[PDB]
A = this chain, B = another copy of it.
């Protein structure tokens, strides 16, 4: 929220949310703008189990 409110989610910045729950927080807010985030996921929803 703070790198949005100061406007550091434009192109050029790059992030890594080094959690195992990349899609557990609100990444819809930073989803546009140009800041290429990355992450790590253990619960892959493309599975039968």
Contact = CB atoms under 8 A, between A and B. Distances in A.
Interface of A: 4-7, 9-10, 29, 32-35
* This protein's copies in its complex: 3
Nearest to A29: B5
Interface of A is mostly: loop
Contacts of A9: 7
B29 A7 contact: no
Contacts of A32: 5-7
Contacts of A6: 32-33
A32 to B, nearest CB: 5
Nearest to A13: B7
B7 A34 contact: yes
